[PDB]
Design a protein around this ligand. Structure first.
Ligand SMILES: [Hg+2]
Ligand SMILES: [Hg+2]
Length: 259
């Protein structure tokens, strides 16, 4: 502190001093131990309906970059899986590393990926986002791992606009982007009850983490690392390593949709 971030002086190990819930019973991310996750045949396939998605803007908030969607109606929703009810997409963002061997927040059998995409949705029964985050089933986040390999064509539009939102507080119009181009071929997943992974750390999230990673090229992820944490005209601090490490599982079970 001063304000939280990912540095040595205000990084995740310090958050508990302003947000005591950091040492809570249902904090995220976690390590997914594949041999201890329970297959649960009662879980339903996920239903991702993003064909009427309306993206609006892309913003650098100082901790990541969010692409925001119009959520005033049921245009891009997730339902099914372990969820009851309809959850509307409000924004996506990424977490990534300064090197390719780190960057994801969840890990799989202790394996870290180069980055992790979060598609954040909120439960329509609560009427708005801000009321959703106060309830134990208020949000559902789909997490997708990224590995370095082949380029992902559907991520290129995002990569290309980054130069225009280089520093904190910058935004740019970002319409007609289709988030379908960011899904792996398979929707197999793990699920557990957890929290937002940045302050205020609220325990209101059902996480849905996809088993299959997407590939991005080295050049693509290289462009993420050119962003800045600082605002314009402040000393440059590249936006890298904006990931929280794995927290204790405590009394929770990870369930798998697959065997
Ligand atoms: Hg996130
Ligand atoms: Hg909550």
């Amino acid at each position: 502190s001063h304000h939280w971030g990912y540095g040595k002086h205000n990084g995740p190990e310090h958050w508990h001093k302003d947000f005591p819930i950091a040492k809570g019973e249902r904090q995220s991310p976690v390590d997914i131990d594949t041999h201890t996750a329970k297959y649960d045949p009662s879980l339903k396939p996920l239903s991702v309906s993003y064909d009427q998605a309306t993206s609006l803007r892309i913003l650098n908030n100082g901790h990541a970059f969010n692409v925001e969607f119009d959520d005033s109606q049921d245009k891009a929703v997730l339902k099914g899986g372990p969820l009851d009810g309809t959850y509307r997409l409000i924004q996506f963002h990424f977490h990534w590393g300064s090197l390719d061997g780190q960057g994801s927040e969840h890990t799989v059998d202790k394996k870290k990926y180069a980055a992790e995409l979060h598609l954040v949705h909120w439960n329509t029964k609560y009427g708005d986002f801000g009321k959703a985050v106060q309830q134990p089933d208020g949000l559902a986040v789909l997490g997708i791992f990224l590995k370095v390999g082949s380029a992902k064509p559907g991520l290129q539009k995002v990569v290309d606009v980054l130069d225009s939102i280089k520093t904190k507080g910058k935004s740019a119009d970002f319409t007609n982007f289709d988030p379908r181009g960011l899904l792996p071929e398979s929707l197999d997943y793990w699920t557990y009850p957890g929290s937002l992974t940045t302050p205020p750390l609220l325990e209101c999230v059902t996480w849905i983490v996809l088993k299959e990673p997407i590939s991005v090229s080295s050049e693509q992820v290289l462009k993420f690392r050119k962003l800045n944490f600082n605002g314009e005209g402040e000393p440059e601090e590249l936006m890298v390593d904006n990931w929280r490490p794995a927290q204790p599982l405590k009394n929770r079970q990870i369930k798998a949709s697959f065997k």
